[PDB]
């Protein structure tokens with residue numbers, strides 16, 4: 001096979017929250033369109049695929065000049081895993097060698113430059129994931145986990161709960177915007193986090209994820225800096 | 226000595242953020258007053274002390290009918306630890322036996338009922354802390370910690386990052402509203418988290434902490450249910 005860099009944008013029609021979320025407009029452009037534009041402007045991809053079950057989403061993708069994979073209902077339900085959708089897209093276009101990047105439409109402030117910056121961290125020899133991430137608002141060592149009913153244990157040391165944050169290791173969470181993997185590795189492991197995983201760090205501002213109407217408005221306000 | 230249940234409300238005059246924050250009004254009552262009212266209505270305390278360096282805060286505390294400890298400047302600076310303020314209050318009134326509870330004015334939706342509910346968890350024989358806490362918005366096992374420059378390691382397992390949250394242990398963070406300790410233990414350990422620490426769980430709504438003008442408005446709106 002030819003090695004290919006593939007972008008997969010999963011955009012199902014039924015959004016369990018905000019209705020028709022993937023086509024909702026932000027500064028005049030659909031969420032889908034913002035992420036398609038990021039994929040194109042990154043110049044990182046040989047193939048850009050929108051995977052959907054919805055006719056309106058498919059028409060939007062075609063109007064932006066990218067490929068469409070149609071998902072049957074069982075891969076677009078509320079319970080369907082993202083990994084099964086990415087696997088189905090790769091099987092449909094016939095790629096099992098190269099890289100595959102998931103780009104969620106719910107991260108509209110993730111730009112093509114962010115994608116290029118993340119790609120520069122990918123190690124073609126070692127082939128761990130590159131995942132975009134942002135700093136944790138509340139430090140995860142300053143937490144306790146339930147071990148029994150009404151019984152809790154510190155995440156690490158009890159003394160961590162009173163340590164100045166600057167004296168603790170820096171902590172990060174995935175923000176959903178970018179997951180880059182070696183294609184054969186993603187197929188074999190059937191997941192998005194493959195060791196050794198590297199992080200591409202983004203600001204809290206650029207990590208906004210759209211769930212609510214107020215999220216859409218905040219993202220618009222951020223664009224209008 | 227007589228064993229005493231002491232409440233200490235630390236309320237310094239200089240707020241590094243919102244100016245004069247501890248006297249800012251919320252539905253007509255100062256933040257200080259809301260927490261004093263919680264301490265009184267809990268009926269958990271033999272002594273209620275407001276510790277401050279500020280004349281206006283001291284006058285407000287006296288008007289609510291509680292005791293005042295005056296802190297010298299070195300215990301009320303931007304760098305001064307909360308524990309040193311609680312230790313100084315206990316030394317001033319001469320108590321080293323019983324319980325001591327820190328009640329921060331920045332948690333105005335923490336009520337007297339919350340204080341009673343937390344106190345019911347305190348174990349007078351084993352004498353670990355009781356700390357009020359709320360659920361973590363982002364699960365702390367779904368994080369990575371920096372171990373070297375540009376090198377990160379999962380908090381626990383890499384597979385935790387893709388686990389449904391409901392399949393992970395429940396996680397909680399202190400919310401700042403209540404810290405209950407055995408008095409002799411707090412003096413000896415010079416800290417607020419003493420094993421075995423128990424958690425009193427509060428909702429995200431009741432855990433609001435005041436840092437901004439918008440925080441004050443949100444807390445007011447919550448009160449007006």
Ligand SMILES: CC(=O)N[C@H]1[C@H]([C@H](O)[C@H](O)CO)O[C@](OP(=O)(O)OC[C@H]2O[C@@H](n3ccc(N)nc3=O)[C@H](O)[C@@H]2O)(C(=O)O)C[C@@H]1O
Nearest residue numbers: 010011012022075080081082085104105106174175176192
């Ligand atoms: C990679 C992955 O597991 N993605 C999941 C993400 C991820 O964990 C977070 O965003 C990280 O912060 O979480 C979810 O993210 P969510 O349900 O909002 O979906 C994000 C975007 O992906 C599309 N989608 C999702 C699943 C699927 N089978 N097909 C799809 O087309 C949606 O239409 C939307 O554009 C979640 O909220 O539960 C579910 C997603 O499946």
Ligand SMILES: CC(=O)N[C@H]1[C@H]([C@H](O)[C@H](O)CO)O[C@](OP(=O)(O)OC[C@H]2O[C@@H](n3ccc(N)nc3=O)[C@H](O)[C@@H]2O)(C(=O)O)C[C@@H]1O
Nearest residue numbers: 235236237247300305306307310329330331399400401417
């Ligand atoms: C127990 C403890 O360590 N408290 C600290 C808390 C705590 O960790 C969080 O609230 C938990 O979510 O964090 C701080 O909390 P913060 O600075 O807002 O202070 C909270 C309240 O305590 C008063 N205060 C604080 C310290 C001190 N030496 N004297 C005081 O009178 C303030 O006037 C205000 O009413 C922080 O933001 O850094 C600093 C506080 O010292």
Ligand SMILES: [Ca+2]
Nearest residue numbers: 106209210211
């Ligand atoms: Ca989501």
Ligand SMILES: [Ca+2]
Nearest residue numbers: 331434435436
């Ligand atoms: Ca604070």
